Amino acid sequence: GALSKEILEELQLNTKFTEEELSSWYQSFLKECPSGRITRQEFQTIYSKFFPEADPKAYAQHVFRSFDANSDGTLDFKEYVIALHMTSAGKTNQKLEWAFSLYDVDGNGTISKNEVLEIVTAIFKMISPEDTKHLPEDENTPEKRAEKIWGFFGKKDDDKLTEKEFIEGTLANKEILRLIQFEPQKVK
Numbered sequence: 402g403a404l405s406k407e408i409l410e411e412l413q414l415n416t417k418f419t420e421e422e423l424s425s426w427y428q429s430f431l432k433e434c435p436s437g438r439i440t441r442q443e444f445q446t447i448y449s450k451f452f453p454e455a456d457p458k459a460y461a462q463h464v465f466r467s468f469d470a471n472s473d474g475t476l477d478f479k480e481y482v483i484a485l486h487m488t489s490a491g492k493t494n495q496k497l498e499w500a501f502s503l504y505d506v507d508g509n510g511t512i513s514k515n516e517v518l519e520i521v522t523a524i525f526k527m528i529s530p531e532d533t534k535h536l537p538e539d540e541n542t543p544e545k546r547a548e549k550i551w552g553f554f555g556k557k558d559d560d561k562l563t564e565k566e567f568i569e570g571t572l573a574n575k576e577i578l579r580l581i582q583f584e585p586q587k588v589k
């Protein structure tokens with residue numbers, strides 16, 4: 402097929418390849434995935450291959466789920482391309498609403514204390530133990546990282562974090578941005 406003028410428009414406001422190039426990638430994608438769909442197991446394998454120093458299965462599953470809040474089924478080429486952009490390219494502040502969808506594990510519209518710990522833990526496993534030693538003491542375990550996040554938002558244990566407030570805080574408080582950071586290369 403051809404990449405629809407519509408998906409190209411979709412992709413080019415959310416990422417950066419070009420129209421023709423995304424078609425080129427698409428034609429190759431179709432050769433390898435004839436149905437134009439990729440399963441969660443297939444998507445996980447991409448992360449397994451390219452993060453040999455890490456244990457990225459949980460992270461990849463959460464990233465996959467951010468495009469349905471469902472684990473079964475598939476992604477299409479558009480979601481697959483956007484997923485790779487989110488994890489690996491561009492600047493974080495252009496990604497804040499997607500970050501919210503990542504952290505809202507159950508997709509119920511708000512973020513809970515446990516959901517922060519789940520995603521923080523998954524991201525934490527993307528970092529080698531070599532790199533883990535260079536992290537500051539008060540931010541070197543998933544529990545410390547996740548509790549610092551929850552405290553930066555002024556939250557009690559049973560509170561619910563809205564998208565409005567998540568965007569505000571990730572924009573304003575650069576310590577929050579550092580702690581919620583989901584691109585493995587940027588978790589320094």
Ligand SMILES: [Ca+2]
Nearest residue numbers: 505507509511
């Ligand atoms: Ca939730």
